[PDB]
């Protein structure tokens with residue numbers, strides 16, 4: 131029993147992190163087979179903050195302008211190309227520690243592990259969720275760009291995030307590993323702001339199901355709700371709409387606990403109305419929204435504590 | 437910016453985890469040099485679990501009774517012995533992935549990373565603190581015994597915890613890697629209960645400093661206090677006493693933020709007396725006590741491994 135924000139073991143990703151230098155700028159890259167992936171803004175100068183023309187900056191570079199260091203070893207860059215907002219540096223050595231992997235673009239609400247890195251060397255690992263406004267609430271300092279987010283369902287690493295920048299509110303924006311930004315953000319230092327963020331409703335429900343599995347029922351009630359009335363109430367607290375897809379996705383947790391999804395919805399409605407009145411759920415005094423249904427099933431007993 | 441509960445990168449430990457089987461029991465072991473460490477309770481069966489005589493259970497076993505798998509490779513056990521509550525299985529091969537390491541015993545309040553494992557296969561990593569009552573609030577299912585906790589101090593892994601059991605309240609108990617329990621617990625299936633826990637004061641203060649560094653300031657005030665007056669408040673709210681050593685340890689964060697420790701104690705006093713009045717601190721509606729001073733400095737500075 132117990133319930134913690136739990137990351138994937140990071141070793142398969144640690145073996146892929148390198149340092150990329152261009153001019154006076156150093157950040158991190160991801161070395162898979164014979165390609166190093168990193169944010170294209172590594173080629174930007176002080177003059178290129180606001181309106182970089184990346185095509186024009188890149189054509190002026192040779193292979194030997196990029197320094198890639200993997201531990202104590204220099205790799206030799208033998209090619210370069212840009213794909214969307216990522217740079218792909220072809221190197222003369224395949225990474226002998228390359229795991230089985232794939233690149234996946236995630237949807238808001240999905241969670242992943244972040245391996246924060248500086249100078250190509252891992253600092254720490256933590257769990258994040260892609261917020262509804264396409265930001266993440268990470269922990270990143272200068273030099274952390276090119277740190278990646280991933281899942282490891284089975285033995286295969288799914289890379290889903292590469293870190294590019296911090297927005298004025300202190301939240302974080304980045305790309306998939308094909309270099310497409312999450313959300314309406316661009317790799318320019320112009321005024322950009324994330325939209326108002328909302329709570330990830332399906333994840334809160336999942337977490338309430340985790341609480342029941344771990345043996346806590348205090349917040350349930352005798353009521354039910356229609357999906358439409360739930361959404362009308364939940365929107366007034368800045369909760370995302372719950373869809374029929376979300377209801378379907380919660381089916382297994384429902385089945386395991388004997389609590390219908392719309393009955394759990396009625397519990398959530400009452401929690402929003404009442405607060406917790408001095409109580410906690412799985413150790414928290416707020417409703418937690420960074421655990422998915424899949425995360426709950428992965429972490430929790432398949433046997434409910436009745 | 438930002439502040440997150442963050443574990444050490446786990447790869448140096450992942451390369452040391454193996455599966456240990458004895459009879460119908462499988463759990464995890466730690467393979468360092470030519471020794472595999474695991475809980476001695478692996479040798480227990482159902483009728484023994486109430487009052488095991490470990491000496492007597494062990495003498496009946498041959499080397500070949502212990503099946504050790506490192507990935508898909510069987511290791512050959514060439515010796516077996518007990519140290520306190522851990523079993524030490526001598527194997528014929530040194531682990532080529534053995535990191536620089538030490539065995540250390542930590543103090544209550546100290547944090548560490550746990551690499552949860554099942555069948556010798558790492559499943560997840562999270563940060564824990566050794567509670568004042570010598571339990572940890574972990575997340576462990578059947579098959580997780582022998583999972584380890586660690587810190588990394590440079591390139592050196594300090595192993596500090598091996599998982600043995602779950603108490604009735606759903607919190608967790610285990611040993612150092614020399615097999616000495618944290619807390620007044622024993623390795624048998626009997627009525628055992630955690631003592632009442634307290635809040636780790638120095639760590640709450642550290643976290644308040646993290647909050648200020650990350651721009652969250654509403655709880656600061658004009659007031660200061662003394663160690664003695666604050667300690668009367670701490671005791672009333674089931675907080676650990678704050679010592680002068682704690683004050684010294686927080687010195688850096690005091691200097692950096694311009695909030696003396698006893699000034700921050702006056703903030704904490706008011707929070708304990710009045711609550712948060714609807715507000716949050718670093719996204720929490722409770723006072724967090726599982727970040728140490730060193731954790732806060734390390735994450736607000738970007739140290740790597």
Ligand SMILES: *C(N)c1ncn(C[C@@H](O)COc2cc(Cl)ccc2Cl)n1
Nearest residue numbers: 463477480485578579580581623624
């Ligand atoms: C750890 N891998 C694990 N998995 C299941 N369990 C529960 C029981 O197997 C515990 O068994 C014992 C524990 C102790 Cl502390 C003494 C004796 C026994 Cl049989 N643990």
Ligand SMILES: *[C@@H](N)c1ncn(C[C@@H](O)COc2cc(Cl)ccc2Cl)n1
Nearest residue numbers: 157171174179272273274275317318
């Ligand atoms: C990432 N490693 C990092 N470290 C510091 N910074 C701040 C600036 O250096 C980033 O500069 C740019 C960012 C973008 Cl998105 C476009 C252009 C530039 Cl110059 N980032």
Ligand SMILES: [Cl-]
Nearest residue numbers: 658659660661
């Ligand atoms: Cl005063």
Ligand code: NA
Nearest residue numbers: 657659699702
């Ligand atoms: Na004060």
